[PDB]
Design a protein around this nucleic acid. Structure first.
Ligand SMILES: [Mg+2]
Ligand SMILES: [Mg+2]
Ligand SMILES: [Mg+2]
Ligand SMILES: [Mg+2]
Ligand SMILES: [Mg+2]
Ligand SMILES: [Mg+2]
Ligand SMILES: [Mg+2]
Ligand SMILES: [Mg+2]
Ligand SMILES: [Mg+2]
Ligand SMILES: [Mg+2]
Ligand SMILES: [Mg+2]
Ligand SMILES: [Mg+2]
Ligand SMILES: [Mg+2]
Ligand SMILES: [Mg+2]
Ligand SMILES: [Mg+2]
Ligand SMILES: [Mg+2]
Ligand SMILES: [Mg+2]
Ligand SMILES: [Mg+2]
Ligand SMILES: [Mg+2]
Ligand SMILES: [Mg+2]
Ligand SMILES: [Mg+2]
Ligand SMILES: [Mg+2]
Ligand SMILES: [Mg+2]
Ligand SMILES: [Mg+2]
Ligand SMILES: [Mg+2]
Ligand SMILES: [Mg+2]
Ligand SMILES: [Mg+2]
Ligand SMILES: [Mg+2]
Ligand SMILES: [Mg+2]
Ligand SMILES: [Mg+2]
Ligand SMILES: [Mg+2]
Ligand SMILES: [Mg+2]
Ligand SMILES: [Mg+2]
Ligand SMILES: [Mg+2]
Ligand SMILES: [Mg+2]
Ligand SMILES: [Mg+2]
Ligand SMILES: [Mg+2]
Ligand SMILES: [Mg+2]
Ligand SMILES: [Mg+2]
Ligand SMILES: [Mg+2]
Ligand SMILES: [Mg+2]
Ligand SMILES: [Mg+2]
Ligand SMILES: [Mg+2]
Ligand SMILES: [Mg+2]
Ligand SMILES: [Mg+2]
Ligand SMILES: [Mg+2]
Lengths: 104, 208, 83, 99
RNA sequence: UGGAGAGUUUGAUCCUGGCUCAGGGUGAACGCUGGCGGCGUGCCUAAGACAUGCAAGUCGUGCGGGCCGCGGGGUUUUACUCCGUGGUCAGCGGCGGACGGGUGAGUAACGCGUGGGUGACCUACCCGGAAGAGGGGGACAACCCGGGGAAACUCGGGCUAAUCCCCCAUGUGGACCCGCCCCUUGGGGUGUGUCCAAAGGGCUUUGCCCGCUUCCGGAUGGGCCCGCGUCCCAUCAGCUAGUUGGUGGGGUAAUGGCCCACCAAGGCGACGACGGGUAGCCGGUCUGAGAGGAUGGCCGGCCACAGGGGCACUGAGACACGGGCCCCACUCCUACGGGAGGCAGCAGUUAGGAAUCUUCCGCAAUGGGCGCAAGCCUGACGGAGCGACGCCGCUUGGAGGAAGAAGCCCUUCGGGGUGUAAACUCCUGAACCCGGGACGAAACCCCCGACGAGGGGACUGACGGUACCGGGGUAAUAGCGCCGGCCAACUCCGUGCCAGCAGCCGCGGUAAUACGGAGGGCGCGAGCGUUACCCGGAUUCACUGGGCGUAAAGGGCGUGUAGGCGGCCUGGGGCGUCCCAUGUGAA
């Protein structure tokens, strides 16, 4: 079976491609606590239907480009800026953490 | 190895009456009488409270020395007795008693077990038919153990076996005297043995 | 090409061959495709030759060339109804 | 020294040229067909295209190409030739292409 | 079926806490010692350099020859020439040299492990099924002249065969463009158009054997893609222009930014990107009560490399260890222009090192390449040789006293030990000596039958006269470490913070069970000790299973971002969680 992941379109900023954040909820090896990891998938979006904030099922597929190896199967729920905002702010904080705290 | 040295010095280092000299023992001289104190120039002094370790070692040495075998070979049996099902304590003795050199002493073919391991090495003993020159061979129940056909009529044999007539053996052995044979019936119980040792200690020693 | 040969499994001076189908390129005693019986040249048991006769005719039906000296084991355990 | 499995080498060179020439034909022969197709030469363009497809399947037979290599090379041909005669031309010769 | 603790901070105590010891392991080495077999195992350094020898070929049933023969022909005879058959050599051609054998340098990576995908693909030889071979033409070596080069070799000229190359024909069928269909990524049909098939040998020769051609399946082997897993350093926080995506083309067996031209401006990172360190991964292995820790050596699977770097050719498959080209670094030959090599194949040599083996036998068995077969080739492999390096089995049967000009002890020659412990009472009989003597080996082949049908009383053994079996028979090697507590084992003399011991605590300063002898004792025994390393004890990185008032440890205090965590009731969903069935988890 070609694997089928579900996630959130956190990026529309591409030509015929959408970045889909997928979360996985698994128990920790030694310590047993449940932990939440995630990774982004570049998904192939032909008629650029699926827009930002959407929740889709992606599917394993014949390669389209480098690292772009998934096609968007079907839409599940429509929009939700919040899910993206959770992702946006995670990258916002990065502006600190550097060699110092700049004026950005 | 197999010790091979002054036997009766250790008859009294360990303490209790040991029978490795054979029937050299019953005539008041397996060193037992006269001097029951340990060998050396310190045999006659009141010792101290031996460490709980010592009394394990001392109890384990009795068992090794009474069957007269290598420590290297002795320990190899203890491993395969804890590994085996059932009580690790008595399983061990079931295997010591199962050794062929001992089954020959037990069946009164040779007056001594020590003197009997040499009897086997020289192929005077058969098992179900074929010769066996191995004191390590593990007899299984049903194995008729006999004296060599060609080598039958001999010195120590004729003497030792005739004095065995009018004598009975352990409940786990049958014996034919006037045909020198007799099967190995059963693996002996802890009750079936008159061994002046507390094996529970001997376990404790290795389970250190 | 897929074959049916003998792989050696005994020890020094104790040959115990094992009858396997395998790719011919692969080494003698390596990852074989499936084992279908054993051989014991010293005849030290009542059953010194055994072979899954059903599976044999499968692999034969899809072109497993057997060694000349392994063929004789199959003719031996009636892998072919010859008469 | 002298391992006479180097016979194998000199034998390759004999082969190397055969392919090298065989497909150097296709190259400069294919080029010709799509050239006549870009001018809508039609009759010439297919009379040349036809013998160019042949020369490909030929080269496939032996060892030079074989497989889908000859196939797609054939396909990349006709595909392009047609889309050039359809730019005002009409395949009025009817050589190697389906109506 | 599974869990032991001890010594050591104090005048003494309880904590805390480190150090050490007892256990198990080893591809080991070093010291003393060393009898036998069997089976394993044996450069951990220099992936340094390598002498010599052998290590991948085969087929005359693909083709034509060269050389040395021998015989039979045509002529009245010779000359000239025709045919047959031996031996040998390479050439052309087919298949194989991409397996097998070696290594761990590199690689933190879809490399490996595990589970899936391929409507994105390939697969020589093998298996099953359907169909086919008609006619013409060409060349290049071998050979034959000629030239250059010291050599390695190289150049020109001429002739010729083929299962070598090529053009027509046949189209079962297949490939391609374009369509009306069914499928749904490039999976199957179907029509018109174009395009593509072939080889001949062998005999007991007009019918059999080995081949050849196109196509459809099967099997085997493999490419590519994805989920998850996979070391340390944050005193490595930002990284990236083919960079990220797109349309189009190239290329491939096939997807893709793999590559190219244009267009868009993306992609990645604290869930650790980028950089640095280290390392082939796994099955497994050692340890541990387990959870865990350590490891990847033999064996098996995969990957990577073949003096270092790069590259294509040939082919079903190679970027090709014993193939080709180029550059570099070495070592050789050099008629100074140039040429020749690559043991990380089996042995072997030298170097480095604490340390790691025979230039042995064999084609008998197993496996592989080619061949119709006969057979050949096979340092794969099967055996032997060396090394207590490991594991296991085995021998040294054991019934008899004591005389120091520097080693038989015990109170200033004194009281007992060694100890039933023999240079000699019996008995059995390792070594050794005679004789028998293997299994491993029945196929390939030839006979009868339908050249697979119980007929092969064809032939086949390196190991090896070895193992095993029977007869004869000799009392016939014992070491090493310990003995103050942990830690089983105590006495005398010498020595006086000296000589020395020492794993930790410590002992030696004249009365030392601690140093050095001796007697005795303990442990183990063809071994015993030392050093090195791993886990253990260590609940001393605490998931099981620890802590932070004074023992080490609460941030100087706050605000709050990410993240972690969340009161009571009802309903849907079923990601976590639980259960059943099932596929996988090779050996
Ligand atoms: Mg050849
Ligand atoms: Mg203090
Ligand atoms: Mg003190
Ligand atoms: Mg104390
Ligand atoms: Mg090395
Ligand atoms: Mg000839
Ligand atoms: Mg030849
Ligand atoms: Mg790195
Ligand atoms: Mg994977
Ligand atoms: Mg010429
Ligand atoms: Mg041809
Ligand atoms: Mg044609
Ligand atoms: Mg490395
Ligand atoms: Mg080298
Ligand atoms: Mg290279
Ligand atoms: Mg090939
Ligand atoms: Mg090619
Ligand atoms: Mg390579
Ligand atoms: Mg090669
Ligand atoms: Mg080589
Ligand atoms: Mg070598
Ligand atoms: Mg040296
Ligand atoms: Mg060797
Ligand atoms: Mg063979
Ligand atoms: Mg070998
Ligand atoms: Mg036989
Ligand atoms: Mg043969
Ligand atoms: Mg037969
Ligand atoms: Mg003590
Ligand atoms: Mg000392
Ligand atoms: Mg003194
Ligand atoms: Mg002393
Ligand atoms: Mg001491
Ligand atoms: Mg031993
Ligand atoms: Mg721990
Ligand atoms: Mg633990
Ligand atoms: Mg805890
Ligand atoms: Mg603590
Ligand atoms: Mg303080
Ligand atoms: Mg404090
Ligand atoms: Mg505070
Ligand atoms: Mg929450
Ligand atoms: Mg809640
Ligand atoms: Mg669920
Ligand atoms: Mg399961
Ligand atoms: Mg398994």
């Amino acid at each position: 079976p070609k694997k089928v992941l579900t996630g959130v379109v956190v990026s529309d900023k591409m030509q015929k491609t959408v970045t889909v954040l997928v979360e996985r909820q698994f128990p920790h090896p030694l310590y047993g606590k449940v932990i939440k990891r995630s990774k982004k998938y570049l998904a192939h979006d032909p008629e650029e239907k699926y827009k930002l904030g959407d929740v889709v099922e992606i599917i394993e597929s014949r390669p389209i480009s480098k690292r772009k190896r998934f096609r968007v199967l079907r839409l599940v729920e429509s929009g939700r800026m919040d899910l993206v905002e959770k992702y946006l702010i995670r990258r916002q904080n990065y502006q600190s953490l550097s060699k110092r705290g700049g004026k950005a | 190895g197999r010790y091979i040295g002054p036997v009766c010095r250790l008859c009294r280092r360990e303490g209790v009456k040991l029978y490795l000299k054979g029937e050299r023992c019953y005539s008041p001289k397996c060193a037992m009488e006269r001097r029951p104190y340990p060998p050396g120039q310190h045999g006659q002094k009141r010792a101290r409270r031996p460490s709980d370790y010592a009394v394990r070692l001392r109890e384990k040495q009795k068992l090794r020395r009474i069957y007269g075998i290598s420590e290297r070979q002795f320990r190899n049996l203890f491993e395969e007795a804890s590994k085996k099902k059932g009580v690790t304590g008595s399983v061990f003795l079931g295997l010591l008693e199962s050794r062929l050199d001992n089954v020959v002493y037990r069946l009164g073919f040779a007056v001594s077990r020590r003197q009997a391991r040499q009897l086997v090495r020289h192929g005077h003993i058969t098992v179900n038919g074929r010769r066996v020159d191995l004191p390590s061979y593990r007899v299984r129940p049903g194995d008729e153990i006999a004296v060599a056909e060609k080598s039958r009529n001999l010195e120590l044999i004729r003497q030792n076996l005739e004095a065995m007539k009018g004598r009975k053996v352990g409940p786990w052995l049958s014996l034919d005297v006037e045909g020198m044979k007799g099967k190995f019936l059963r693996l002996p119980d802890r009750e079936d043995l008159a061994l002046p040792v507390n094996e529970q200690l001997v376990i404790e020693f290795y389970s250190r | 090409m897929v074959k049916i040969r003998l792989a050696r499994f005994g020890s020094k001076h104790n040959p115990h061959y094992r009858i396997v189908v395998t790719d011919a390129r692969r080494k003698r005693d390596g990852k074989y495709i499936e084992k279908i019986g054993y051989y014991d040249p010293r005849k030290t048991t009542p059953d010194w030759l055994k072979v899954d006769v059903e599976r044999a005719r499968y692999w034969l039906s899809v072109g497993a060339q057997p060694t000349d000296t392994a063929r004789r084991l199959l003719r031996q355990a009636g892998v072919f109804r010859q008469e | 020294r002298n391992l006479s499995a180097l016979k194998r080498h000199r034998q390759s060179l004999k082969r190397r040229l055969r392919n090298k020439a065989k497909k150097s034909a296709i190259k400069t022969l294919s080029k010709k067909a799509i050239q006549l197709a870009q001018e809508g030469k039609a009759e010439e363009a297919l009379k040349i295209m036809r013998k160019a497809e042949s020369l490909i399947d030929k080269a496939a037979k032996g060892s030079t190409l074989h497989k889908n290599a000859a196939a797609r090379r054939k396909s990349r041909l006709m595909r392009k030739v047609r889309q050039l005669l359809e730019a005002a031309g009409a395949p009025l010769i009817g050589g190697g292409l389906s109506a």
